Amino acid sequence: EPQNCSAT
Amino acid sequence: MIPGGLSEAKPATPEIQEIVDKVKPQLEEKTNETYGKLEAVQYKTQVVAGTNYYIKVRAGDNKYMHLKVFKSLPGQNEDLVLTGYQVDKNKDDELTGF
Amino acid sequence: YPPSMDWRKKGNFVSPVKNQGSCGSCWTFSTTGALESAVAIATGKMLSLAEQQLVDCAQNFNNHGCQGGLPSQAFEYIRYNKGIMGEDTYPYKGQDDHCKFQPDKAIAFVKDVANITMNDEEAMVEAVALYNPVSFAFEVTNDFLMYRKGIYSSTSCHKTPDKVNHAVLAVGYGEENGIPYWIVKNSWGPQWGMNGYFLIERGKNMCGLAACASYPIPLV
Numbered sequence A: 001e002p003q004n005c006s007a008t
Numbered sequence B: 001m002i003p004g005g006l007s008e009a010k011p012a013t014p015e016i017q018e019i020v021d022k023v024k025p026q027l028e029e030k031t032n033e034t035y036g037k038l039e040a041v042q043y044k045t046q047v048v049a050g051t052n053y054y055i056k057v058r059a060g061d062n063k064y065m066h067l068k069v070f071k072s073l074p075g076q077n078e079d080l081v082l083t084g085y086q087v088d089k090n091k092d093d094e095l096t097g098f
Numbered sequence C: 001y002p003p004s005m006d007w008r009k010k011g012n013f014v015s016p017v018k019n020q021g022s023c024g025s026c027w028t029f030s031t032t033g034a035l036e037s038a039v040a041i042a043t044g045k046m047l048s049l050a051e052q053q054l055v056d057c058a059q060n061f062n063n064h065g066c067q068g069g070l071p072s073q074a075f076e077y078i079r080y081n082k083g084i085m086g087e088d089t090y091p092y093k094g095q096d097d098h099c100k101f102q103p104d105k106a107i108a109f110v111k112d113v114a115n116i117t118m119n120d121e122e123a124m125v126e127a128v129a130l131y132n133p134v135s136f137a138f139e140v141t142n143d144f145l146m147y148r149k150g151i152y153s154s155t156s157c158h159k160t161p162d163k164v165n166h167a168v169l170a171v172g173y174g175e176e177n178g179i180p181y182w183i184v185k186n187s188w189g190p191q192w193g194m195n196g197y198f199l200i201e202r203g204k205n206m207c208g209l210a211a212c213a214s215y216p217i218p219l220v
């Protein structure tokens, strides 16, 4: 799914 | 945090103030002004081929400034260079990139 | 999977070390590296990809120019955007510009994105042993900044998603003196560490070493 590290 | 964002913000620490104090002359060479005591209040960090500092300095009384300094890697020599600054900043104002 | 693995040794599969300056575009260097390697691993043609592009345009994939990003999302960016051009046509500037993407210029492409499962360091080793240099993001500290040589261990860094703050490229692995490590390419120039490269403690998810790692599958 969307890799969790990228946000902001 | 994203791999390159600025960190969440933390209270200013004694080293931040060192950085601001070591840096104060550069604000002045650029704005040709003379500030009283510039007190560090908050800062954020960002890893690059060094570290970029995003500090919230109280340089007046009820007026805040936002400096941006770049501290080099421990092997490439050189000192803290004021890469940018934002005039007229509220105390609550979120520190941001630039 | 062999105990050792150096993608740089197998052949001409790792592009020169380079730095990102004061711009937080490490993820783009993480990104460009995985893809230059793959195409190299598949075609033997060595190419350098423009990180500026990812800086100026990978916006719709949750990236944020010189203020942050992540290889996985950027990998998606190149699939959907139909490619990435090199540098000679999209040179590095280290600052947020506006998109100058030009289709007829793209010289490298992406078909699939293989996202290593979260916290699965072992799978990362698999991907590196059989397939391609992997891109990951760990947790840097002023501690790490002084690195000069040897296997970088760390007790100050936590592992979890949050403090993960610096994407790089796992290009190999091994063990010395009984300590298993990761060979890594960094984006700070041929002066820092072991000529841009640094070794880091392997086997314990050192500084959230495998919280968000992935590699590309080039369309060639």
Ligand SMILES: *[C@@H]1O[C@H](CO)[C@@H](O[C@@H]2O[C@H](CO)[C@@H](O[C@@H]3O[C@H](CO)[C@@H](O)[C@H](O)[C@@H]3O)[C@H](O)[C@H]2NC(C)=O)[C@H](O)[C@H]1NC(C)=O
Pocket: A001, A002, A003, A006, C060, C061, C062, C072, C073, C074, C076, C077, C080, C113, C115
């Ligand atoms: C692997 O990790 C990446 C990074 O999070 C994931 O990327 C996401 O991939 C989806 C499709 O699988 C992308 O959706 C597409 O969005 C574009 C742009 O709006 C559009 O052209 C398409 O209609 C499609 O919806 C999504 O943008 C992308 N997200 C990011 C942040 O890159 C990917 O899903 C992960 N794969 C797995 C199996 O977990």
